[PDB]
């Protein structure tokens, strides 16, 4: 009851006014300019984080599961403990610190074409370092969401999904998320509490619909910048 709800797990993100792209670029620029003190002072591990996310989703039965950009296997390992290794397929480019019984495919996620699954996991995306054009990090993560898009738009989409959204305030990202809600009839973008302030990572979970994604991302980026200032500043 009062257990079921979130809770301090995720931020509350009600929609608000603003351009998410510009507020997102604004706090990225500010962060890039922070000194060594400010930045650090505010700056297989995913095993636990996926368990939290799946607990929020009411612990659904996973079934046939593809884990995209599986990396070291943290997410695949949790599925195997939850349901055995038979149903999991792990895709990444190659290392692998998870159960070797889990089936793996060495392939570029942007070239592997989708197939039908019960559960779609994606934990890809990368945070670029300050010495970069802002648009290059946005384009790179956009192109990864474009690949996930083909998994979500196939004739029978994933019943369950956990899709990391590394850079959620681009037009591609927001348009991709709104399209996936229409396609699947569900989906909510969450900000896990306790994620490092140094990224903009959100997660798109296959729970009951929550719309106005564009305003909630704006609220996220505005709220994150304020918390970045609080932590970076002393006294």
Residue numbers in the entry: 42 to 84, 99 to 149, 155 to 295
The publication says:
Alongshan virus (ALSV), a newly discovered member of unclassified Flaviviridae family, is able to infect humans. ALSV NSP1 is a typical flavivirus NS5-like protein. It carries two essential enzymatic activities: the methyltransferase (MTase) and the RNA-dependent RNA polymerase (RdRp). The flaviviral NS5-MTase functions to catalyze the methylation of viral RNA cap.
The crystal structure of apo ALSV MTase was determined using the single-wavelength anomalous dispersion method and finally refined to a resolution of 2.5 Å, with Rwork and Rfree values of 0.209 and 0.258, respectively. Clear electron densities could be observed for residues E42-K84, S99-W149 and E155-A295. Amino acids Y85-P98, E150-E154 and D296-R313, however, were unable to be traced due to high flexibility. Overall, the ALSV enzyme has a globular fold, which can be further divided into three subdomains (the N-terminal and C-terminal extension regions and the core region). The N-terminal extension region consists of an extended loop followed by a helix-turn-helix motif (helices A1 and A2). The core region folds into a seven stranded β-sheet (strands β1-β7) surrounded by four α helices (helices αX, αA, αD and αE), which reveals the general αβα-Rossmann-fold. The C-terminal extension region consists mainly of an α-helix (helix A3). The overall structure of ALSV MTase is similar to those of the MTase proteins from canonical unsegmented flaviviruses. For ALSV MTase, it contained a long-extended N-terminal loop, which was not present in DENV3 MTase. In addition, following the helix-turn-helix motif in the N-terminal extension, the ALSV enzyme also featured with a shortened loop that is highly flexible (amino acids Y85-P98 being untraceable in the electron density map).
